[PDB]
Amino acid sequence: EVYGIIAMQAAYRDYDSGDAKQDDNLGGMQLNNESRIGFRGKKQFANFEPTFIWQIEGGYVDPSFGGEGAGLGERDTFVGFESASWGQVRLGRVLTPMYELVDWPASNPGLGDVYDWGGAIGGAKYQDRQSNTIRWDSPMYADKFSIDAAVGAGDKAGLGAGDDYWGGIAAHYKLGPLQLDAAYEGNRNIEAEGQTWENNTYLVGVQGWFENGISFFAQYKYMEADASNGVNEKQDAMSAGLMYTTGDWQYKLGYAANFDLERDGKTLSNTSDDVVSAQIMYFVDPSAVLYARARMNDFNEGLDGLDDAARWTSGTNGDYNEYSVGVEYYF
């Protein structure tokens, strides 16, 4: 089967970076084309009870701030086996059990700059979609509760340039109209900033969908990191969204924040981020949505890593506002 998401976004960004020319460069109107094509299939092998599964998803064909063209394999691309009793295993390039919860529901709408790849902690707070991964997805036991578990090689190890690795686990419990979410990921042997890091991230969250048209999510994220020179780093984050669905319309309000980072017990001032976001969506078809969105990003002011150089964050490029309309169509 061939499948795709046709997704187009017209986004105007107003920056406040402290540099005029930079504001002019980074800001403006762009088209963010996250359309992607994929191929996937199953196959029952004659001499293996679990069914063979595979997928090859392409990348964003023309994102904002990037050139045109995406290769096959940039997104979830894997082989695996699945069974009714014990779920499915996937080998390849998949989402981490934690990241899937960071991204959905907690990074929508436009909360990702703060909650996804934002934050100031050192090392690698978690992976987002990793190659060289094995991931187990249990079935929904008792149609109430599920487990996601994975281990994989790290970014450098996947090039023969390191020995980083990571493991992660996530669990969900269905409770009436509520979903309870908990996740963990630990990264090891991370070479960065002249050190070797260990990261440990914890996430708890709730999702609710109610017959009254209200739905919500909220997550609390706790990230610890330890360098090989004895330094300890800590940062917390949160994200929440409030939704009213009436007829063909969805009103959604979103807020996410990273809090001050702690280095060796000392709070670092102005290492916090937050984003406020509002979105109106129209269910234009059972397979498509239109949406309008505005958001406000307030980023940290910068911090040095452990190598006496500036450490990159999602705020490095500066605070900005974004106004956008878009379309998403699934097939």
Binding site: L95, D103, W312, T316
Partner: peptide
């Protein structure tokens, strides 16, 4: 899904 790290 995914990131934008640097």
């Amino acid at each position: 899904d995914g990131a934008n790290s640097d």
